[PDB]
Amino acid sequence: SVSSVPTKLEVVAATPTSLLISWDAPAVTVVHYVITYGETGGNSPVQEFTVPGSKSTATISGLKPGVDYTITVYAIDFYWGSYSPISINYRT
Amino acid sequence: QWALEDFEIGRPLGKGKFGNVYLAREKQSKFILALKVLFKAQLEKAGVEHQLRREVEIQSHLRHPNILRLYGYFHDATRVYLILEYAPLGTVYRELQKLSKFDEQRTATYITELANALSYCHSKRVIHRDIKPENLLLGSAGELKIADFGWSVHALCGTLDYLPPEMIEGRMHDEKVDLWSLGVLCYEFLVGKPPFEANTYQETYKRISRVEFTFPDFVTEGARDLISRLLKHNPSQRPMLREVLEHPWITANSSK
Ligand SMILES: CO[C@@H](C(=O)N1Cc2[nH]nc(NC(=O)c3ccc(N4CCN(C)CC4)cc3)c2C1)c1ccccc1
C-alpha cells in the first residue's frame, strides 16, 4: 500500500488510438513489467501484455478515441515475485 | 497474506549482516512479532539472495516449539522482509557469556530441547541445522529456538568449530552430522568453549579430524559419557537422537 514498483507512471505522448507510457525503474533488476489496460467504465475486458525489465517505456495501441482508460503497471522480481502496482487514468 | 502494511515497526532488537531485526506488532491485534530486514543489494553483492529465497521456503514448513517460526516473507524495491517469531530472551550465546558455563541441569534441558527439534527436522528429511550458541534464540520460558540462516547473523567464525570430520573434508554426509554438533554444543555449554578450539585453521582441522579434545576435571562421568558417544569420527557409530534423549545423564538432569 505504501510503495509500488515502478513509480511515476505517465503518458508522455499519444495519438487518437495509442498511448506512449513511461515509468521510473528501481535500482534492483526487474524480470519484466506487467502492463494492463482497459476502459475505466469497468465493463470492457482488461488487456494485458509484458515488457522486458530493461525497458522503461511501452506503447499501448488499438485504443478507441475519446474513451477513458485505466493503465496499471507492476514489476516482477526474479526471486520475490510481483511488486505492488501503480495505476493512472488517461482519456484518449 | 502478510504484507508490510500489517505491522507497526518498533525498536531494533539487533543488527544482522544484511539489515536490522525489529520488534513488530501486527496492527489489528497488536500481536508481538519480529521483522527481519535483508537489503537486496547486499544479498546480491554477497551472492546469497538465491540461498535466502530457497531457505525461507524451507524454514516456513518447520513447525516445532524449539524452532523459531517463520510466518511469511515479502519485499519492496530495496529490501526483503521476514516475519519471524519473537524470542524475548536473546541468544543463548549471551547467556553463556554471562554465566561463563551452564550447570548440568540447564545443559541437559537444552540438549533435550535440541534433540527434540532435530528429531522433528530429521522426520522431514532436513538435516545439518545450525545449533551454535550465537545462532540459538531463547523463548519466553527460556527454551531454545533454532534460527538457522546463520550466514545472515552478525558475529572469527564459529562454523569450523562445530563441523564434523566428514564436513571439513567435504565428503558426503547424512543426519549424523547433527549428533556430532550436539556433542560439540553439550561440551561448550558445560565448559564454556568448544572442544576443538585452536588458534589456526590447520590446527583446528587437525583437532577435529583426529577428534582430539580433553575434558576439564569438573566435567562429570555422565556428561563425558554422552559427549564421547556423540563425538565419534565414524558417523554411523554416533547414537540415535532417541538414545540421547534416553541417556542416563540426560534423564537424571533434564527438566523436560
Ligand atoms: C540476525 O537475525 C536474528 C533473527 O533472525 N532474529 C529473529 C528473532 N526473533 N526474536 C529475536 N530476538 C532478538 O533478536 C533479541 C535480542 C536480544 C534480546 N535481549 C538481550 C538480552 N536479554 C537478557 C534481554 C533481551 C532479546 C531478543 C530475533 C532475532 C538472529 C539473531 C541471533 C541469532 C539468530 C538470529
Coordinates of C-alpha atoms and ligand atoms in Angstrom, one line a residue:
Chain A
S1 CA 0.0 0.0 0.0
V2 CA 2.8 2.4 0.8
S3 CA 5.1 1.6 -2.2
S4 CA 4.8 0.4 -5.8
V5 CA 7.2 -0.7 -8.5
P6 CA 7.5 1.0 -10.9
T7 CA 6.9 4.6 -9.7
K8 CA 5.8 7.8 -11.5
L9 CA 3.9 6.2 -14.4
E10 CA 2.8 8.7 -17.0
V11 CA 1.6 9.1 -20.6
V12 CA 4.3 11.1 -22.4
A13 CA 2.8 11.1 -25.9
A14 CA -0.4 10.0 -27.6
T15 CA -2.3 9.6 -30.9
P16 CA -6.1 9.2 -31.1
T17 CA -5.7 5.4 -30.8
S18 CA -2.4 4.9 -29.0
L19 CA -0.5 5.9 -25.8
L20 CA 3.2 6.0 -25.1
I21 CA 3.7 5.3 -21.4
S22 CA 6.8 5.8 -19.3
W23 CA 7.9 4.9 -15.8
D24 CA 10.8 5.0 -13.4
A25 CA 12.7 1.8 -12.9
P26 CA 14.1 0.8 -9.5
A27 CA 17.8 0.0 -8.8
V28 CA 17.3 -3.7 -8.5
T29 CA 17.0 -5.8 -11.6
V30 CA 13.5 -6.5 -12.8
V31 CA 12.5 -9.5 -14.9
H32 CA 9.7 -7.8 -16.8
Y33 CA 6.8 -5.3 -16.3
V34 CA 3.1 -6.4 -16.5
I35 CA 1.0 -3.8 -18.2
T36 CA -2.8 -3.9 -18.0
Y37 CA -5.2 -1.5 -19.6
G38 CA -9.0 -1.3 -20.2
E39 CA -11.9 1.1 -20.4
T40 CA -12.3 2.7 -17.0
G41 CA -16.1 2.0 -17.0
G42 CA -15.3 -1.5 -15.7
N43 CA -17.4 -3.2 -18.2
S44 CA -14.9 -3.8 -21.0
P45 CA -12.3 -6.6 -20.5
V46 CA -8.8 -5.8 -19.3
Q47 CA -6.0 -6.4 -21.8
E48 CA -2.5 -7.4 -20.5
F49 CA 1.0 -7.7 -22.0
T50 CA 4.5 -7.8 -20.7
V51 CA 7.6 -5.7 -21.4
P52 CA 11.2 -6.7 -20.6
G53 CA 12.7 -5.3 -17.4
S54 CA 15.4 -3.5 -19.4
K55 CA 12.6 -1.1 -20.8
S56 CA 11.1 1.9 -19.1
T57 CA 8.6 2.8 -21.9
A58 CA 5.9 1.0 -23.8
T59 CA 3.2 1.6 -26.5
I60 CA -0.4 0.8 -25.9
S61 CA -2.2 0.7 -29.3
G62 CA -5.5 -0.2 -30.8
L63 CA -7.4 2.1 -28.4
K64 CA -10.7 3.8 -29.0
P65 CA -10.7 7.6 -29.4
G66 CA -12.3 9.7 -26.7
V67 CA -12.5 7.0 -24.1
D68 CA -11.3 6.9 -20.5
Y69 CA -8.7 4.2 -19.8
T70 CA -7.0 2.9 -16.7
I71 CA -3.4 1.7 -17.1
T72 CA -1.6 -0.4 -14.5
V73 CA 2.0 -1.5 -14.4
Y74 CA 3.8 -3.7 -11.8
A75 CA 7.3 -5.2 -12.0
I76 CA 8.4 -8.8 -11.2
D77 CA 11.3 -9.7 -9.1
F78 CA 13.0 -13.0 -10.1
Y79 CA 13.2 -14.3 -6.6
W80 CA 10.5 -12.5 -4.7
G81 CA 7.7 -12.2 -7.2
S82 CA 5.5 -9.3 -8.1
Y83 CA 5.6 -5.8 -6.6
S84 CA 2.6 -3.6 -5.8
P85 CA 1.1 -2.0 -8.9
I86 CA 0.7 1.7 -9.9
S87 CA -2.3 2.9 -11.8
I88 CA -3.1 6.1 -13.9
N89 CA -6.0 7.3 -15.9
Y90 CA -5.9 8.8 -19.4
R91 CA -8.6 9.9 -21.8
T92 CA -7.6 9.3 -25.5
Chain B
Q1 CA -1.3 -12.8 3.1
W2 CA 1.1 -11.0 5.3
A3 CA 2.3 -7.6 4.0
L4 CA 4.4 -4.7 5.3
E5 CA 1.4 -2.5 6.0
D6 CA 0.2 -5.0 8.6
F7 CA 2.9 -4.2 11.1
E8 CA 4.0 -1.3 13.3
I9 CA 7.8 -1.3 13.4
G10 CA 9.1 -1.0 16.9
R11 CA 12.6 -0.8 18.4
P12 CA 15.6 -2.7 16.8
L13 CA 16.4 -6.0 18.5
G14 CA 19.8 -6.1 16.8
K15 CA 21.6 -5.8 13.6
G16 CA 22.2 -8.7 11.2
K17 CA 24.8 -8.9 8.4
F18 CA 22.3 -7.7 5.8
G19 CA 20.0 -5.5 7.9
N20 CA 18.3 -4.9 11.2
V21 CA 15.8 -7.0 13.1
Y22 CA 12.9 -5.1 14.6
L23 CA 10.3 -5.8 17.2
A24 CA 6.9 -5.5 15.4
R25 CA 3.2 -5.5 16.2
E26 CA 0.5 -6.8 13.9
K27 CA -1.6 -3.6 13.6
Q28 CA -5.0 -5.2 14.0
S29 CA -4.3 -7.4 17.1
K30 CA -1.0 -5.9 18.5
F31 CA 0.5 -9.4 18.5
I32 CA 4.2 -9.2 19.0
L33 CA 6.5 -10.5 16.2
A34 CA 10.0 -9.8 14.9
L35 CA 10.6 -8.2 11.5
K36 CA 13.9 -9.1 9.8
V37 CA 15.2 -6.9 7.0
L38 CA 17.7 -8.0 4.4
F39 CA 18.8 -5.5 1.8
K40 CA 18.6 -6.9 -1.8
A41 CA 21.7 -5.1 -3.0
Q42 CA 23.6 -6.6 0.0
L43 CA 22.2 -10.1 -0.7
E44 CA 23.3 -9.9 -4.3
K45 CA 26.8 -8.5 -3.6
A46 CA 27.3 -11.4 -1.2
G47 CA 25.8 -13.9 -3.6
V48 CA 23.3 -15.2 -1.1
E49 CA 19.9 -14.0 -2.5
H50 CA 19.2 -17.3 -4.2
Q51 CA 20.2 -19.1 -0.9
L52 CA 17.9 -16.8 1.1
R53 CA 15.0 -17.4 -1.3
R54 CA 15.4 -21.2 -1.0
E55 CA 15.8 -21.2 2.7
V56 CA 12.8 -19.1 3.6
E57 CA 10.7 -21.7 1.8
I58 CA 12.4 -24.5 3.7
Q59 CA 12.0 -22.8 7.1
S60 CA 8.4 -21.9 6.6
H61 CA 7.4 -25.6 6.8
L62 CA 9.2 -26.3 10.1
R63 CA 6.7 -26.1 13.0
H64 CA 8.2 -27.1 16.3
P65 CA 8.3 -25.4 19.8
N66 CA 12.1 -25.3 19.7
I67 CA 12.4 -24.0 16.1
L68 CA 11.8 -20.3 15.5
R69 CA 8.6 -19.8 13.5
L70 CA 8.9 -18.1 10.1
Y71 CA 5.4 -16.9 9.3
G72 CA 6.0 -15.3 6.0
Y73 CA 8.1 -13.0 3.8
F74 CA 7.6 -10.1 1.4
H75 CA 9.7 -7.5 -0.3
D76 CA 9.9 -4.0 -1.7
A77 CA 12.2 -2.3 -4.2
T78 CA 15.2 -2.5 -1.9
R79 CA 14.5 -5.0 0.9
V80 CA 13.4 -8.5 1.6
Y81 CA 11.4 -8.8 4.9
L82 CA 10.9 -11.9 7.1
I83 CA 8.1 -12.1 9.7
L84 CA 9.6 -14.2 12.5
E85 CA 8.5 -15.4 15.9
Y86 CA 9.7 -13.1 18.7
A87 CA 12.2 -14.7 21.1
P88 CA 12.4 -12.3 24.0
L89 CA 15.4 -13.7 25.9
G90 CA 18.0 -13.2 23.2
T91 CA 20.7 -15.7 22.2
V92 CA 22.0 -18.5 24.4
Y93 CA 25.5 -17.2 23.5
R94 CA 24.9 -14.1 25.5
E95 CA 23.6 -16.2 28.4
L96 CA 26.8 -18.3 28.2
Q97 CA 28.9 -15.1 28.3
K98 CA 27.0 -14.0 31.4
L99 CA 27.2 -17.3 33.3
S100 CA 30.6 -18.4 31.8
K101 CA 29.3 -22.0 31.7
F102 CA 26.0 -23.8 32.4
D103 CA 25.3 -26.4 35.1
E104 CA 24.2 -29.9 34.1
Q105 CA 20.5 -29.3 34.7
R106 CA 20.5 -26.3 32.4
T107 CA 22.7 -28.1 29.8
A108 CA 20.7 -31.3 29.8
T109 CA 17.5 -29.4 29.4
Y110 CA 18.9 -27.5 26.4
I111 CA 20.2 -30.8 24.9
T112 CA 16.7 -32.3 25.3
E113 CA 15.1 -29.4 23.5
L114 CA 17.5 -29.6 20.6
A115 CA 17.3 -33.3 20.3
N116 CA 13.6 -33.0 20.0
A117 CA 13.8 -30.3 17.4
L118 CA 16.5 -32.2 15.4
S119 CA 14.4 -35.4 15.5
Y120 CA 11.5 -33.4 14.1
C121 CA 13.8 -32.0 11.3
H122 CA 15.1 -35.5 10.5
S123 CA 11.5 -36.7 10.2
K124 CA 11.2 -34.1 7.5
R125 CA 14.5 -35.2 5.9
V126 CA 16.0 -31.8 6.8
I127 CA 19.5 -32.2 8.4
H128 CA 22.5 -30.1 9.5
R129 CA 20.8 -27.5 11.5
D130 CA 22.7 -24.5 12.9
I131 CA 22.9 -25.0 16.6
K132 CA 25.9 -22.9 17.5
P133 CA 25.1 -20.8 20.6
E134 CA 25.4 -17.5 18.7
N135 CA 22.6 -18.7 16.4
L136 CA 20.2 -20.1 19.0
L137 CA 17.5 -17.8 20.5
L138 CA 15.5 -18.2 23.7
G139 CA 11.8 -18.2 24.1
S140 CA 9.8 -16.5 26.9
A141 CA 10.2 -19.7 29.1
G142 CA 13.9 -19.9 28.4
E143 CA 13.5 -22.6 25.8
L144 CA 15.9 -22.8 22.9
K145 CA 14.8 -21.7 19.4
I146 CA 16.8 -22.8 16.3
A147 CA 17.1 -20.0 13.8
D148 CA 19.3 -21.2 11.0
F149 CA 20.2 -18.6 8.3
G150 CA 23.5 -18.5 10.2
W151 CA 25.2 -16.7 7.3
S152 CA 22.8 -13.8 7.9
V153 CA 23.8 -13.5 11.6
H154 CA 26.5 -11.0 12.7
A155 CA 29.3 -12.4 14.7
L156 CA 36.3 -15.5 13.9
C157 CA 33.8 -18.0 12.6
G158 CA 32.1 -20.5 14.8
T159 CA 31.2 -22.7 11.9
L160 CA 34.5 -24.6 11.8
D161 CA 34.4 -25.5 15.5
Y162 CA 31.1 -27.3 15.0
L163 CA 31.7 -29.1 11.7
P164 CA 32.1 -32.9 11.9
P165 CA 35.1 -34.6 10.3
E166 CA 33.1 -35.6 7.2
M167 CA 32.2 -32.0 6.5
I168 CA 35.6 -30.5 7.0
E169 CA 36.9 -32.9 4.4
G170 CA 33.9 -32.1 2.2
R171 CA 32.7 -35.7 2.0
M172 CA 29.1 -36.9 1.7
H173 CA 27.2 -36.5 5.0
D174 CA 23.9 -37.6 6.5
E175 CA 21.8 -36.8 9.5
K176 CA 24.6 -37.9 11.9
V177 CA 26.2 -34.5 11.4
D178 CA 23.6 -33.2 13.9
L179 CA 24.6 -35.8 16.5
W180 CA 28.2 -34.5 16.3
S181 CA 27.1 -30.9 16.5
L182 CA 25.0 -31.9 19.6
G183 CA 28.2 -33.3 21.3
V184 CA 30.2 -30.1 20.4
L185 CA 27.4 -28.0 21.9
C186 CA 27.0 -30.1 25.0
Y187 CA 30.7 -29.6 25.7
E188 CA 30.6 -25.8 25.1
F189 CA 27.6 -25.5 27.4
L190 CA 29.3 -27.3 30.2
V191 CA 32.9 -26.0 29.7
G192 CA 32.3 -22.5 28.2
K193 CA 34.2 -23.0 25.0
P194 CA 34.0 -25.6 22.1
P195 CA 36.2 -28.7 22.4
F196 CA 38.3 -28.4 19.3
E197 CA 39.2 -24.7 19.5
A198 CA 42.6 -23.8 18.2
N199 CA 44.5 -20.6 17.1
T200 CA 44.8 -21.6 13.4
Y201 CA 42.6 -23.3 10.8
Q202 CA 45.1 -26.1 10.1
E203 CA 45.4 -26.8 13.9
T204 CA 41.6 -26.8 14.4
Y205 CA 41.2 -29.0 11.3
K206 CA 43.7 -31.4 12.7
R207 CA 42.0 -31.5 16.1
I208 CA 38.6 -32.2 14.5
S209 CA 39.8 -34.8 12.1
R210 CA 41.6 -36.7 14.9
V211 CA 38.8 -35.9 17.4
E212 CA 41.5 -34.6 19.8
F213 CA 39.9 -33.0 22.8
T214 CA 40.2 -33.1 26.6
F215 CA 37.7 -32.6 29.5
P216 CA 38.2 -30.2 32.4
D217 CA 38.3 -32.1 35.7
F218 CA 34.9 -30.8 36.7
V219 CA 33.0 -32.5 33.8
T220 CA 31.2 -35.4 35.4
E221 CA 31.4 -39.0 34.1
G222 CA 27.8 -39.0 32.8
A223 CA 28.5 -35.8 30.8
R224 CA 31.8 -37.3 29.5
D225 CA 29.9 -40.4 28.5
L226 CA 27.3 -38.6 26.5
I227 CA 29.7 -36.2 24.8
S228 CA 32.1 -39.1 23.9
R229 CA 29.3 -41.1 22.5
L230 CA 28.4 -38.2 20.2
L231 CA 32.0 -37.2 19.1
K232 CA 32.7 -40.3 17.1
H233 CA 34.7 -40.0 13.9
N234 CA 32.6 -42.6 12.2
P235 CA 29.1 -41.1 11.8
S236 CA 27.3 -44.5 11.8
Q237 CA 28.8 -45.0 15.3
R238 CA 27.1 -41.9 16.6
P239 CA 23.9 -42.7 18.5
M240 CA 20.3 -42.1 17.5
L241 CA 18.6 -39.0 18.8
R242 CA 16.4 -41.3 20.9
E243 CA 19.5 -42.6 22.6
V244 CA 20.5 -39.1 23.5
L245 CA 17.0 -38.3 24.9
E246 CA 17.2 -41.5 27.0
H247 CA 20.8 -41.3 28.0
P248 CA 21.1 -41.7 31.8
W249 CA 22.8 -38.3 32.3
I250 CA 20.1 -36.6 30.3
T251 CA 17.1 -38.1 32.1
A252 CA 18.7 -37.5 35.5
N253 CA 19.4 -33.8 34.8
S254 CA 16.8 -32.6 32.3
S255 CA 13.7 -30.9 33.5
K256 CA 12.0 -31.9 30.2
Ligands
LIG1 C1 20.1 -11.7 12.7 O1 18.9 -12.5 12.8 C2 18.4 -12.6 14.0 C3 17.0 -13.1 13.8 O2 16.7 -13.7 12.8 N1 16.0 -12.9 14.8 C4 14.6 -13.3 14.7 C5 14.2 -13.1 16.1 N2 13.2 -13.3 16.9 N3 13.4 -12.8 18.1 C6 14.6 -12.3 18.2 N4 15.2 -11.7 19.3 C7 16.3 -10.9 19.4 O3 16.9 -10.5 18.5 C8 16.6 -10.5 20.8 C9 17.9 -9.9 21.1 C10 18.2 -9.5 22.4 C11 17.3 -9.6 23.4 N5 17.6 -9.2 24.7 C12 19.0 -9.2 25.1 C13 19.4 -9.8 26.4 N6 18.3 -10.3 27.2 C14 18.7 -10.7 28.6 C15 17.2 -9.4 27.1 C16 16.6 -9.3 25.7 C17 16.0 -10.2 23.1 C18 15.7 -10.6 21.8 C19 15.2 -12.4 16.9 C20 16.4 -12.2 16.0 C21 19.2 -13.6 14.9 C22 20.0 -13.2 15.9 C23 20.7 -14.1 16.7 C24 20.6 -15.4 16.4 C25 19.9 -15.9 15.3 C26 19.1 -15.0 14.5

